[PDB]
């Protein structure tokens, strides 16, 4: 167009292996040509994390907390093999954990939808954002074995020196067993609620909290009550304003309704075992290359976007041998659009906001037009039947998006 | 032909609405013309359960425990609307719960496969039986709310006065929240394992056991260990003889593995509830009318079979107005075959065993020949594209299976 859009302040974290390659391609072909940013970029590549003794990771989280918008590229989480591969000098903790443990918030995973790409439920036309309440990786489980008869109890001792309360979870009369301890601070539940409500107002969809309060009448009921409270004291007004609404459901009714729904709703959910933050998601159904992720902070201001997958090592290896690759960039691309979309919102930057949207529509439109990477072509035909003529390589795809983006932005000039 | 197959003692449970109708059809058109049974019939119809203050439900459970074979028709779980519709004098509990509660066991959900009916994975050609740990009974976690700052610790107090052990669940410093303790006796794990290993032998496929032994190194470790103990010590041999095996996994991996599989295997889940993935979808994708359910007890003798779906009220309603309906009877039919097949096994009744399998083949063969109910067809062409000539009535279909069962059994004697 004319002058690049003044995007504002954004925090960018560079990553590793395959994602680092496509990441640079995204900035070079889809972001920089149209937006000027006051970039606070930190190199979270493994060699740099090692070199700075992981100091860069903290600095990145610090930066996000302060500039509110963070976009992250996938990073290698060291294990024995990695320690050996790069001669690391210590097994560095996952940077995703370090970041999440400093900013707090709830992660919401979404799978971009395309009409010509199969969904678990054909009827799903609009996406389904899902945020699971989970402790960070800094959480340590409290489970033991119990070898033989005896009683197991759970106890609460007020710190003000008042009557101690004991409960008796189970008395093992014969044989042994196994037992767990679990907890949740009200604050965490509030945060969970806040991040959930906001998320729904930004997207413009109805929120649904699923719990199993029928069984955990006090545990889960706690979530239910705290949601309603926060929903009435604040939010409800805006939900009605935006034609949206909040509402509770028993995990059993959700999974059923969800199966008969067309989609388009925020699904916050508390599971029996609870969950713990992890880097990976779970292959499952649908291409990981289409799985977005967003760490939404309680304050309504801070947000960190990233793809749901990892660095895609296998793909990288081939790229390292000069082999042709076909890595999906949608998930990474959406990390940028969601970040810029949030940015534009905090600053009432109409232009940037339009840009953010445009890039997503072009991403989706490009695929629905028949242009896609191998992973998607395989969702349509199945690995065995997929031919090369069925897809584009990593670079050809990036090139197609950029072309279509150029067309999209020109057409909007009217 | 002449003399009918002499089946043995089978406990039957009549149900409600639409299923009650297809249930009698199955009996008149598919079972009674070829098999004489020593029937212990219990009317679990909503009106009758109400008239007997639910004593019929308990007598049926008592009867199943006695004759080891029970087939069941879908039943109505009363809710407020149901209470008002039948002027119930109490909101009766799920007869399914009362029965599993009395019998104990592990429910196995298996979807019947048909070559011309789309599946989740074009690769799955063999069934994927999913069984979940049936806590039910009076088991329950001990949850409570934490008023304010204080410590919450779980304690194990040995019977042999041995060293008492204390674990800290969490120290509420901000004060406020919720906490809880969970437990599990070795026996439950054992029964679970027994039902699993057995179920993998009845069918002829390997058996996996998914777990999160990485997060809950003690709790889940117990399942892994106990499943192996009981395996080596009681099933290793038998599995070998059938060229079958057993291994442990990780939920994350299992779900992937299944996707990239051809099917044919038993999957035992320790997992709780469902979420954003193919749980209830893996066991039964598409139509609920092909979803079977089997309760297997530890004793390897008792079994309760029933369709996974419900009474199909929507169809029953149409039927009441004299509107044509197309209700899939496949699930209901397999509840009868699995049951009779088990009767046959327990009594070395080669004729009955022949009949059971014979009836299943006819069902599947009939659908693969293009004769099916509207739920299917919809799976093929999609609701919008289904035309009347694409499927059959609840009746026209039961009729088609009748003529086909006759041939099948006729040409068998020769
Ligand atoms: N920074 C993060 O958020 C994050 C998250 C998870 C993992 N990781 C890191 O990644 C490394 C291990 O990687 P991983 O094996 O778990 O990989 P991954 O990136 O999660 O994906 C594993 C497989 O998913 C498919 N896939 C994922 N993204 C794809 C895309 N964009 N396009 C096409 N196919 C895609 C590929 O299947 P095919 O091979 O069948 O094509 C690939 O082999 C570790 O160093 C780990 O710490 C980082
Ligand atoms: N006894 C049990 O195991 C059990 C289990 C679940 C529910 N229920 C009871 O069923 C009643 C409510 O029923 P629900 O709404 O949950 O119904 P449902 O029987 O579970 O099925 C709901 C929908 O599934 C489809 N469907 C299910 N079985 C089908 C079949 N055999 N052939 C064709 N389509 C089939 C129909 O879709 P279309 O409407 O799109 O055709 C039907 O409306 C309650 O009284 C509830 O307690 C009993």
From Swiss-Prot, chains A, B:
GO terms for molecular function: cadherin binding; identical protein binding; isocitrate dehydrogenase (NADP+) activity; magnesium ion binding; NAD binding; NADP binding; protein homodimerization activity. Keywords: Acetylation, Cytoplasm, Glyoxylate bypass, Magnesium, Manganese, Metal-binding, NADP, Oxidoreductase, Peroxisome, Phosphoprotein, Tricarboxylic acid cycle. One of its GO terms (biological process) is glutathione metabolic process. InterPro entries: IsoCit/isopropylmalate_DH_CS, Isocitrate_DH_NADP, IsoPropMal-DH-like_dom. Changing residue 132 to C: In colorectal cancer and glioma samples; glioblastoma multiforme; somatic mutation; found in patients with cartilaginous tumors; abolishes magnesium binding and alters enzyme activity so that isocitrate is no longer converted to alpha-ketoglutarate but instead alpha-ketoglutarate is converted to R(-)-2-hydroxyglutarate; induces histone methylation; enhances expression of chondrocyte-related genes; disturbs the formation of cartilaginous matrix; inhibits osteogenic differentiation. It catalyses: D-threo-isocitrate + NADP(+) = 2-oxoglutarate + CO2 + NADPH. Its EC number is 1.1.1.42. Changing residue 132 to H: In a glioma sample; glioblastoma multiforme; somatic mutation; found in patients with cartilaginous tumors; abolishes magnesium binding and alters enzyme activity so that isocitrate is no longer converted to alpha-ketoglutarate but instead alpha-ketoglutarate is converted to R(-)-2-hydroxyglutarate. The modification N-acetylserine is found at residue 2. The modification N6-succinyllysine is found at residues 126, 400. The modification Phosphoserine is found at residue 389. Disulfide bonds: none annotated. Acetylation at Lys-374 dramatically reduces catalytic activity. It is found in: Cytoplasm, Cytosol; Peroxisome. GO terms for cellular component: cytoplasm; cytosol; extracellular exosome; extracellular region; ficolin-1-rich granule lumen; mitochondrion; peroxisomal matrix; peroxisome. The modification N6-acetyllysine is found at residues 81, 224, 233, 243, 321. It is linked to Glioma: Gliomas are benign or malignant central nervous system neoplasms derived from glial cells. They comprise astrocytomas and glioblastoma multiforme that are derived from astrocytes, oligodendrogliomas derived from oligodendrocytes and ependymomas derived from ependymocytes. Genetic variations are associated with cartilaginous tumors such as enchondroma or chondrosarcoma. Mutations of Arg-132 to Cys, Gly or His abolish the conversion of isocitrate to alpha-ketoglutarate. Instead, alpha-ketoglutarate is converted to R(-)-2-hydroxyglutarate. Belongs to the isocitrate and isopropylmalate dehydrogenases family. Homodimer. PANTHER family: ISOCITRATE DEHYDROGENASE [NADP] CYTOPLASMIC, NADP-SPECIFIC ISOCITRATE DEHYDROGENASE. Catalyzes the NADP(+)-dependent oxidative decarboxylation of isocitrate (D-threo-isocitrate) to 2-ketoglutarate (2-oxoglutarate), which is required by other enzymes such as the phytanoyl-CoA dioxygenase. Plays a critical role in the generation of NADPH, an important cofactor in many biosynthesis pathways. May act as a corneal epithelial crystallin and may be involved in maintaining corneal epithelial transparency. NCBIfam families: nadp_idh_euk (TIGR00127), PRK08299.1 (NF006156). This is Isocitrate dehydrogenase [NADP] cytoplasmic. It comes from Homo sapiens. The gene is IDH1.
């Amino acid at each position: 167009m004319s002058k690049k859009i003044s995007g504002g302040s954004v925090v960018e974290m560079q990553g590793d292996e395959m994602t680092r390659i496509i990441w640079e391609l995204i900035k070079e072909k889809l972001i920089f040509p149209y937006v000027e940013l006051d970039l606070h970029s930190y190199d979270l590549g493994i060699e740099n994390r090692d070199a700075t003794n992981d100091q860069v990771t903290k600095d990145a989280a610090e930066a996000i907390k302060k500039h509110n918008v963070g976009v992250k590229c996938a990073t290698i989480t060291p294990d024995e093999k990695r320690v050996e591969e790069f001669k690391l000098k210590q097994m560095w903790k996952s940077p995703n954990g370090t970041i999440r443990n400093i900013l707090g918030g709830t992660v919401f995973r979404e799978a971009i939808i395309c009409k010509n790409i199969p969904r678990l439920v054909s009827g799903w036309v609009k996406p389904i954002i899902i945020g699971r309440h989970a402790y960070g990786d800094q959480y340590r489980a409290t489970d033991f074995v119990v070898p033989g008869p005896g009683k197991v109890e759970i106890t609460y001792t007020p710190s003000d020196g008042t009557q101690k309360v004991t409960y008796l979870v189970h008395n093992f009369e014969e044989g042994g067993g196994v037992a767990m301890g679990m907890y949740n601070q009200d604050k965490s539940i509030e945060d969970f609620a806040h991040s959930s409500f906001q998320m729904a107002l930004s997207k413009g969809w109805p929120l649904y909290l699923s719990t199993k309060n029928t069984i955990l009448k006090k545990y889960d009921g706690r979530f239910k009550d705290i949601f309603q409270e926060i929903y009435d004291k604040q939010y409800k007004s805006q939900f009605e304003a935006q034609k949206i609404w909040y509402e509770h459901r028993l995990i059993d009714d959700m999974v059923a309704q969800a199966m008969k729904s067309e989609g388009g709703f925020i699904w916050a959910c508390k599971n029996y075992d609870g969950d713990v933050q992890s880097d990976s998601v779970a292959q499952g159904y649908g291409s990981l290359g289409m799985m977005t992720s967003v760490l939404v902070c309680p304050d309504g201001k801070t947000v960190e976007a990233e793809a749901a997958h990892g660095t895609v090592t296998r793909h990288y290896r081939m790229y390292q041998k000069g082999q042709e690759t076909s890595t999906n960039p949608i998930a990474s691309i959406f990390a940028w659009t969601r970040g810029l979309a949030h940015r534009a919102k905090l600053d009432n930057n109409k232009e940037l906001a339009f840009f953010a949207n445009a890039l997503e529509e072009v991403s989706i439109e490009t695929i629905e037009a028949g242009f896609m990477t191998k992973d998607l072509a395989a969702c349509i035909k199945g690995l065995p039947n997929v031919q090369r003529s069925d897809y584009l390589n990593t670079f050809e795809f990036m090139d197609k998006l950029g072309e279509n983006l150029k067309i999209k932005l020109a057409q909007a000039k009217l």
